[PDB]
Write a protein that binds this DNA or RNA. Sequence first.
RNA 1: CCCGCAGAAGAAGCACCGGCUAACUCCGUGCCAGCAGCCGCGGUAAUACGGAGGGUGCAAGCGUUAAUCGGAAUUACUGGGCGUAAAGCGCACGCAGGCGGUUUGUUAAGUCAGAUGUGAAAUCCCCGGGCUCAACCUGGGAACUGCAUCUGAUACUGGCAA
RNA 2: GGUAGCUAAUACCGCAUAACGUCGCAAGACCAAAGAGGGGGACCUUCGGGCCUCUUGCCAUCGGAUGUGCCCAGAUGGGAUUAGCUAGUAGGUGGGGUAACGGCUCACCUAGGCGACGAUCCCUAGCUGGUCUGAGAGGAUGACCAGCCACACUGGAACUGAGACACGGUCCAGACUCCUACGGGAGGCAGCAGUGGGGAAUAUUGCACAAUGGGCGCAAGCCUGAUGCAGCCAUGCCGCGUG
Lengths: 85, 82, 80, 205
Amino acid sequence: NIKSAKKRAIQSEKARKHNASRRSMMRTFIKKVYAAIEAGDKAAAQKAFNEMQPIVDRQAAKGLIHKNKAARHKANLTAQINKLA
Amino acid sequence: MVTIRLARHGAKKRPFYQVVVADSRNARNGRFIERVGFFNPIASEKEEGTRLDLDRIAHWVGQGATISDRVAALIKEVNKAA
Amino acid sequence: KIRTLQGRVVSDKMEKSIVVAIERFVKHPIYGKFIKRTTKLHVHDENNECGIGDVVEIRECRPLSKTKSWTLVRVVEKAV
Amino acid sequence: ARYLGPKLKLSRREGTDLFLKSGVRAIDTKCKIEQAPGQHGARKPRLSDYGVQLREKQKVRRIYGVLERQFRNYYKEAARLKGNTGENLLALLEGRLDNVVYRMGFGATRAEARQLVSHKAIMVNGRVVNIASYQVSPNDVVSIREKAKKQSRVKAALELAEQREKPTWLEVDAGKMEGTFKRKPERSDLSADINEHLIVELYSK
RNA sequence: CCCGCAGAAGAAGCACCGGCUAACUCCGUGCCAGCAGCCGCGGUAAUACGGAGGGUGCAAGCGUUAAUCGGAAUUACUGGGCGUAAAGCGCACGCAGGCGGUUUGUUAAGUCAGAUGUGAAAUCCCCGGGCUCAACCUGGGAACUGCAUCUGAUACUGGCAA
RNA sequence: GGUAGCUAAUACCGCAUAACGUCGCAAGACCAAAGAGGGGGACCUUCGGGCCUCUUGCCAUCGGAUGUGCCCAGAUGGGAUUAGCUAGUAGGUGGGGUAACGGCUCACCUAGGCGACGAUCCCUAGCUGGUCUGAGAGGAUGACCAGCCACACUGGAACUGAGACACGGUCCAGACUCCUACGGGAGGCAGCAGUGGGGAAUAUUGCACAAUGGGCGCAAGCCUGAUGCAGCCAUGCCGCGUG
């Protein structure tokens, strides 16, 4: 068909690439922090949480996660990490 | 948004409007929240044919509603007195 | 206040679970008779306090799990 | 619509003067009453109850010159309103413009009154009325404009009007071929031959 | 929407005519030709078949069919029936249901009062307005025969105790 | 479609800032963004503009309204010549995923849940305010006008977006057609008109953006088979004429 939707599709695919990159970033950091939790160390996991918080909060404030998922992740991770020590 | 539009129910070649408040995305004469008044363009010599309720439209303006051109001209024509 | 209903147990006890039934009359829309009608729910309880064949009130709350939406408050006439 | 036929056929079949010919010699040679025309209409037909109802309906219909659908709608409207059904029906039917024009005396027969109405003659409140299905309202004025003025028909009708009884509910007026409507007519002034209840009984079934 | 032009001009059809249901007489046909919704009508006189004339019913429409409801009290609650017609099991004995003698208190769950919220606007209805008249549009009421909550009523059933 | 070299921006990304915001019994850690335009006597000007004003826009809070996303209770066709159905099935414990509780999913422990006051299983149908009929109770019915659902050749998935699993937006599988140098590719009138075909049988390959509305734009303006009017059809309800 011939409409104005072609540029819309192109923008959609570009957004797909960008959001996939950011999601991969997020998942890699989540996996590393869970690995540190499984390791059993306290200081290393606390440090990992420390550099990890800013990126997830940045992605939340950019408008990519709806601003509520970040709070759930942070609260659950803090509750999980403080008990094991 | 929330607007104040016009809708008709009359027969062919004989209009009869009925000013109402509803949602923009809905149809012309379909879903509506609450009627507020009416206007008869063809009218007659008789005085009746232009009525409103100023209190309710003022309240709805306060809540954050907008206005249409014809209804604005109408209310300017009547106001409390003009 | 808070609306309440009263019922009967006639139920086994699962882990933190009881089943209740309630009764009330109604007028049939056709013949004018009155017929007993029974309805059944599921309840979330605390410390499995109540037992078989006991009278207990009930009230609703947040949905907890499937088919379980009401919880008890007070128990009156303990045991049979 | 309209009848468009031999009127004295219905005059003779009914068995009573129908006032719809209204010449000058209202005499036997015109009518030949009590004959019941047809091939062998001399024989007495031995009416039955349903026949009595149907014949009364025919009489009341032909006297006022109306078809069937209008009559049924009139009965519906009369029954909707409050009060006695028969009296209300007759009062409503009397209110037709052609009938009041005839009763004022500007004509001789109801049919010629309707003919006058259809040709844009009768005047009310300074506005022309086209149709005879109009319902007159209390306290109105009936008059004739100047285009149809000086027509000998209305003068002849005025002169022959006085042979009738000039019903009280309407003011005869006619000083300058101008009149005045007063009120709804009632049972007393109209003729007592017509029986209301039988029509209602007929529409019952 | 008004004014003007000699101008009767340019304009009526369709069903039925035995009872049910408004209206009949002749000619030809003579168990062939045929109708019809039930009764059925027809072998020499058809008020029923074919034509003619009259009559009857509605009319810019009228008849035919298909489909829905009442006449149907023919699913019967308001409102039927079971000796002889279509109908009482072959008899008993007893869970689950339904229904209960008669006092005195308590209880408000039935039930009944009053208020509040809610039953979207068209339509159905009553007063009026407008389009020359209605059809059609429309101003204000009316009911949406319930639902939920709160306050009261205690004669009857219901749960309690004697 | 691919390769090489150039260029802006409210596009994109780091830093600066950080609280009634997020996480927190507690300190504490952490988070964001944008220019244009209308003029200008005085001032700087390396005469472009800075500078003085005015309109709109961007980013955080807390609130108003308006839609959408969930739960429960009661009503919502016919068949006992359909009597037993159901292991993620019913709960409990802990983790993961959504805007949110949740068998929404995972590993473990219990022995359950539903049913003669119709469960499972069959045939049949979109649902209401209503319409028709009858006095009332009822009985059939869901034509147009309103309200709500579920559906866009037939099966499944998601990205994008505030809001689809998207009617004229993508990707596969399938079957139809149409172009192909035969290696491949395009396509879904059940949107207003219309043809072929089913049938007793239902319209014209029409006008206007002037009225109201919808979407863009500070506005002027631009589209709009939404709509408002047309042409046909005794299809109904009306009113009239044939003296």
